[PDB]
């Protein structure tokens, strides 16, 4: 199915892309909020990996805007040195789970086949 | 706390074992890295390099289930972007490691090799990020022209991405700081003002306070004490109300400026105020700078306190502080026509300058 | 005399007209260049760039006997090495032009772009030559770490070619000079000694004299006056006998060193000797440095002469000379406990330092 | 025929090489004295363009050493800011002519077909 990778850092995007292609998924990629929203609207991904740590546009903002496009959207958040309140808040908004960086490739891979 | 550059070079070593397909060694180093990170300073770039290496490490295992050369080409060819990024990081963090041990010539060499990898990265922010971080390094290395070159490339890319306002403000600070190195405070000021305006738009209090402080220091150094004091007090207000941890630095600028302006009684108030805000946890020396202000601008100069402080600074090799304080002391004594004392401090000034320069060059090619 | 960088950028303009196949314009610029060269400072590298451009210009004529884009690809494709070399020169001389007008940030940018063209040149000396010339530029730009980086790449290649001893000696001088910037004369000395030994092997008197002079200045600055005077006199001997045009510089070092050593009477002899060797044609200011020595180390300091000289230096923006002379004057007055006079000169010192820094940054991004 | 280009600067070598290939000559190239001598010994060129301004090994030295390998050797010297005595001296040693830098491509090209 369709997997949307949202992260402002080239490194993470390259990584998850190589990981999810190996699993046979159709992967999309976005560096910021707007790109992520356009893709959600156009492609309507089955699962999203959202970096809550993006400059200029907080993940909290991006998340709600994705719920607008689709209510049953499946979004897994990932953070690096992220607050506990932003994780807790994201959960209340229907977050399937949270992956702390550096995330274990196997853990996040098993979590994908699950909520997918 | 372990510097991320230190962890970076161990990852480089980890990588070496991987490319020679030595599982036992790779596993050891991988295990060590995972421990060091638990005590590492924050650096999300390092963590990315770590995660990519974890993936590269797994590829090695998946291909061992043929010469090293052959097997290596088998893994790398299909992984162009990964191999290219890893190479970039290994060189980058190696450059920063050299920089952190003051091996500047070595650092530059790695910085240059690292940059050559950028063209193979389809991401403009990644390029900006390199220029920004390197710009800071060149600044610390007092290669201010080269710093300006790089920081101007960072700012260009950042301005093309309006969401990167934070980096834009930081880039403006770097540009101003660079101008300061050439004593062109008037050239720095416009950038500090743009930073202030941007910071207020994004409603970031810390950067509003910092911008105002930077503007005040700029005016103080350009010789506009009135504007300096005005902005110091603006920074003070926003500090006391929303960002108190800036107060010590803000109150020291205000105090010093007031002392140079001959308003010592008013200054002493903010000096005592700043000393009360300082905590033991602090890593700064504003405590010693405050004490120096009291001692040198006191009706009767406190020469013993001054000697103890300068001796203290000498001990921790804080030659920048010695130069600045000695500059002040020389001016204070001159004002009372005590030129013997003045000359003594002028000699301390010139000495401190040479001690700073010597500390900048530790290599021996 | 016209700087070769100025002629270089006009050739760049000439090239632009060629690539847009504008014969009339190309002919005009070609004609101008051929005039400027008749008045240009010596630069065989410029002349090579000129000759290559002459060839490229002829190619344009031979292909006009189709869009600019198409016609351009027709000429360039078969001429890869020519097109690549031209590109390298246009960027190189443009960088030097910026450097010569003190647009340092611009210069660096062109230096970097120029270097990227090197990998496409199959010639190690060409690469060394770039690193050497750029190293000198970075040195003048007081980007001493970057200078060292580049000069170490030049020296590496030069040592692989034993016939390039001259460049090797010059490279050693640059390395020493760089260390001097950080006041590490002890680090410079080994390189100056290797330069001396190499210079004697190739039996080059000028470089023997210069090496000995450099060694003497090194010792003088490291605080070994005896060794300094010893080498000064060695340089003096070889000078008087084979390279007299070095005498003024040699006799000034000797004199200054003798004055600082308290041997003023002996110094005055070499001071008067140096003043007699100076010719009107000279472009140096050793005349003013000699006169300053007489004035400040005289039994009774000649304060009026000193003021006139420092004022003269101020006029021609010779702030380096002001700083050095003011340093001396301050020490002389201190020795007689005349601290008011001392303090005055110390202020001139600090002022000169700031004036130097300001003159290093003329841009205004 | 065979043309030996001797010059320490990449630029000059590229230039003359492109010029003499266009004329159908078989061109050789050397950056220094030794390379030049080895080629003279091995290839025995019909004409040599010798840069008298080469670091470490003066053209005067190189010239005589070429006369050793071949007495009837045809050598044209070229100089940049070169002395008048080194030109005069080179002539006495059997120099066909001298080309000052920057040399005119046509002049040196016509001179080649001449002494060749
Ligand atoms: Mg992020
Ligand atoms: Mg030559």
Numbering used by the authors:
A (entry chain C), D (entry chain C): 4 to 119
B (entry chain A), C (entry chain A): 4 to 68, 77 to 376
What are the paper's exact sentences on this?
We have determined the X-ray crystal structure of a Rap phosphatase, RapH, in complex with its target protein, Spo0F, which is bound to Mg2+, an important constituent of the Spo0F active site. The single wavelength anomalous diffraction method was used to obtain experimental phases and the RapH-Spo0F structure was ultimately refined to 2.20 Å resolution. The RapH-Spo0F crystallographic asymmetric unit contains RapH-Spo0F complexes in two different conformations, reflecting different steps along the Spo0F dephosphorylation pathway. RapH forms dimers in the RapH-Spo0F crystals; this is consistent with gel filtration studies showing that RapH forms stable dimers in solution. Connected to the C-terminus of the RapH 3-helix bundle via a flexible linker and a short helix (α4) is a large right-handed superhelical domain composed of seven pairs of antiparallel α-helices. The RapH-Spo0F structure revealed that the sidechain of RapH Gln47 inserts into the Spo0F active site. We propose that RapH Gln47 orients water for direct in-line hydrolytic attack on the Spo0F phosphoaspartate-54 phosphorous atom. More specifically, this alignment showed that RapHA binding causes the entire Spo0FA β4-α4 loop to dramatically shift and flip toward the active site. The RapHA-induced conformational change in Spo0FA Thr82 is accompanied by the rotation of the Spo0FA His101 sidechain to an internalized position where it enters space vacated by Thr82. It is important to note that while Spo0F is not phosphorylated in the RapH-Spo0F structure, RapHA locks non-phosphorylated Spo0FA in the conformation corresponding to a phosphorylation-stabilized receiver domain, which is characterized by the rotation of both switch residues and the movement of the β4-α4 loop towards the active site. The entire β4-α4 loop, all of helix α4, and a portion of the α4-β5 loop are disordered in Spo0FB as evidenced by a lack of interpretable electron density corresponding to these residues.
